[PDB]
Design an enzyme around this catalytic site. Structure first.
Site, PDB file in Angstrom:
ATOM      1  N   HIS A 119       0.907  -1.075  -0.106  1.00 65.31           N
ATOM      2  CA  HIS A 119      -0.106  -0.062  -0.163  1.00 65.31           C
ATOM      3  C   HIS A 119       0.999   1.137   0.024  1.00 65.31           C
ATOM      4  O   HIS A 119       0.595   2.238  -0.924  1.00 65.31           O
ATOM      5  CB  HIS A 119      -0.914   0.096   1.068  1.00 65.31           C
ATOM      6  CG  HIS A 119      -1.984   1.019   1.262  1.00 65.31           C
ATOM      7  ND1 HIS A 119      -3.178   1.009   0.663  1.00 65.31           N
ATOM      8  CD2 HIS A 119      -1.707   2.335   1.848  1.00 65.31           C
ATOM      9  CE1 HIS A 119      -3.773   2.417   1.442  1.00 65.31           C
ATOM     10  NE2 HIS A 119      -2.962   3.089   1.723  1.00 65.31           N
ATOM     11  N   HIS A 123       1.424   4.527  -2.804  1.00 63.53           N
ATOM     12  CA  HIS A 123       1.703   6.043  -2.586  1.00 63.53           C
ATOM     13  C   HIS A 123       2.987   6.540  -3.113  1.00 63.53           C
ATOM     14  O   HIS A 123       3.076   7.642  -3.936  1.00 63.53           O
ATOM     15  CB  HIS A 123       1.623   6.261  -1.049  1.00 63.53           C
ATOM     16  CG  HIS A 123       0.140   6.325  -0.660  1.00 63.53           C
ATOM     17  ND1 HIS A 123      -0.913   6.955  -1.257  1.00 63.53           N
ATOM     18  CD2 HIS A 123      -0.009   5.820   0.542  1.00 63.53           C
ATOM     19  CE1 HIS A 123      -1.831   6.561  -0.581  1.00 63.53           C
ATOM     20  NE2 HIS A 123      -1.724   5.897   0.878  1.00 63.53           N
ATOM     21  N   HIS A 129      -5.661   7.184  -2.584  1.00 72.52           N
ATOM     22  CA  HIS A 129      -6.668   6.385  -2.311  1.00 72.52           C
ATOM     23  C   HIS A 129      -7.665   5.947  -3.171  1.00 72.52           C
ATOM     24  O   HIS A 129      -8.293   6.893  -4.042  1.00 72.52           O
ATOM     25  CB  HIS A 129      -7.341   6.533  -0.909  1.00 72.52           C
ATOM     26  CG  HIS A 129      -6.291   6.724   0.373  1.00 72.52           C
ATOM     27  ND1 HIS A 129      -6.004   7.823   0.930  1.00 72.52           N
ATOM     28  CD2 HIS A 129      -5.769   5.918   0.965  1.00 72.52           C
ATOM     29  CE1 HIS A 129      -5.278   7.373   1.923  1.00 72.52           C
ATOM     30  NE2 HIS A 129      -4.917   6.257   1.910  1.00 72.52           N
TER      31      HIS A 129
HETATM   32 ZN   LIG Z   1      -2.835   5.162   2.108  1.00 72.54          ZN
END
Ligand SMILES: [Zn+2]
Ligand SMILES: [Ca+2]
Ligand SMILES: [Ca+2]
Ligand SMILES: [Ca+2]
Ligand SMILES: [Zn+2]
Length: 169
Positions: A119, A123, A129
């Site tokens: 995750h 980014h 998101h």
């Molecule tokens: Zn995040």
């Protein structure tokens, strides 16, 4: 999927990472494997490639931290914020910080390091998101006991390929 405002993205395909420090929670090779697999996830579906550095400034600097750690966003103790990562760009941008007030595990008995790392690298690569619930880039850490079944969702693949394209061959 959501890309970030201005769609900052890496202007090169070859990215370096550096694991700046290690958590006491795990064997160093478990931290290495988790991070390596997190990169792989994304490497797999794009023309991005990664290499590791042991000195100097890598594009993606990875570290463990507690509370205040050198940026404007102190961590917050156990639970809640598990980690944070900066969108693509120079210096601190691209970097990923993991809160060591969490108990990082190779499995799901604590906070799974591979999952949060996959995750966060999303980014670091330019994905913000997603609104989609089965996306890795969904804000929602569930303690997915089933890491045995893990697959990047199509929404994640769509988002990352929208930035860098699919794999060349
Ligand atoms: Zn995040
Ligand atoms: Ca950086
Ligand atoms: Ca925390
Ligand atoms: Ca810890
Ligand atoms: Zn930080």
């Amino acid at each position: 999927f959501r890309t970030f405002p201005g769609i900052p993205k890496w202007r090169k395909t070859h990215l370096t990472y550096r694991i700046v420090n290690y958590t006491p929670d795990l064997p160093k090779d478990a931290v290495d494997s988790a991070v390596e697999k997190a990169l792989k996830v994304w490497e797999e579906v794009t023309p991005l490639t990664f290499s590791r550095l042991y000195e100097g400034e890598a594009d993606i600097m990875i570290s463990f931290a507690v509370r205040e750690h050198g940026d404007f966003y102190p961590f917050d103790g156990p639970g809640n914020v598990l980690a944070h990562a900066y969108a693509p760009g120079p210096g601190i941008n691209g970097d990923a910080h993991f809160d060591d007030d969490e108990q990082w595990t190779k499995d799901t008995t604590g906070t799974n390091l591979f999952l949060v790392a996959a995750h966060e690298i999303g980014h670091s690569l330019g994905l913000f998101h997603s609104a989609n619930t089965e996306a890795l880039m969904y804000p929602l850490y569930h303690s997915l006991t089933d890491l045995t079944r893990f697959r990047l969702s199509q929404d994640d693949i769509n988002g990352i390929q929208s930035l860098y394209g699919p794999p060349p061959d």
